Nucleic acid binder design. Structure first.
Ligand SMILES: [Cs+]
Ligand SMILES: [Cs+]
Ligand SMILES: [Cs+]
Ligand SMILES: [Cs+]
Ligand SMILES: [Cs+]
Ligand SMILES: [Cs+]
Ligand SMILES: [Cs+]
Ligand SMILES: [Cs+]
Lengths: 123, 121
DNA sequence: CTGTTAGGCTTAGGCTTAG
DNA sequence: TCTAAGCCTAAGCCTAACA
């Protein structure tokens, strides 16, 4: 019944969220924890820690639908982007594969599910 | 050049009567009607054979028809029923216009939705 | 298995550009 | 210093199948 107002996700929101995800993945690799950013528990924790104004379910849906397809265009270091693509399970179509290989000077190995199997930093 | 065709008063009358009947049916079924969605207008376009698309209808209803409902050539009982059972905001100016045109006193809530009205006739 | 995580619906809000 | 067809995206939240 209540008429809702909607606030967009900003570029700064994406920078903060992606850096959070990267650091938590690195620490989880050191400690042996498997984090799942496409779940909801990760975003429960993110919302508690950052005290975001947005809900965890909203963050999960948005991350899966908007942030993951746009990760390769983020204003982030290319090594960070490649680590995230390799360790999160983000689809990369053929055209995007070529675009990434060209703009990052890398060699991608992408599977039949279009997930990133591996990469070589050819620089 | 894409020619555009305005919604007519007849379009609005048929759409509002359809919405009224669907609201009555939803009340009897105990379900919530969602005329600002898309499925409702898919069903409407199918039933009425209107030549405009469902997405066009949904946008138009939300943005044009709801703010203009009080000006419709419909019985004020139906207009006030629709205002009461659809999320339609009523600002102070529109509230006064309604009270004068229909000879009623409106009780409008903090969400600027119609709570109730008293017929002064 | 209860968390993950695809996919559906509403409807708020943006773009293009005809009237 | 326009309004709003015509269509769209996606915020926001949800469900449901699979593991
Ligand atoms: Cs914050
Ligand atoms: Cs991957
Ligand atoms: Cs209402
Ligand atoms: Cs599980
Ligand atoms: Cs799943
Ligand atoms: Cs748009
Ligand atoms: Cs116009
Ligand atoms: Cs579902």
């Amino acid at each position: 019944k209540r008429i809702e107002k909607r606030t967009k996700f900003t570029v700064d929101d994406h920078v903060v969220a992606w850096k959070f995800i990267y650091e938590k993945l690195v620490e989880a690799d050191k400690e042996g924890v498997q984090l799942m950013p496409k779940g909801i528990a990760f975003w429960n924790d993110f919302v508690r820690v950052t005290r975001s104004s947005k809900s965890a379910t909203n963050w999960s849906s948005h991350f899966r639908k908007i942030m993951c397809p746009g990760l390769h265009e983020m204003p982030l270091h290319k090594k960070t982007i490649l680590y995230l693509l390799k360790n999160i399970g983000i689809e990369i179509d053929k055209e995007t594969e070529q675009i990434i290989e060209r703009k990052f000077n890398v060699k991608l190995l992408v599977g039949i599910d279009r997930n990133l199997i591996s990469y070589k930093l050819l620089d």
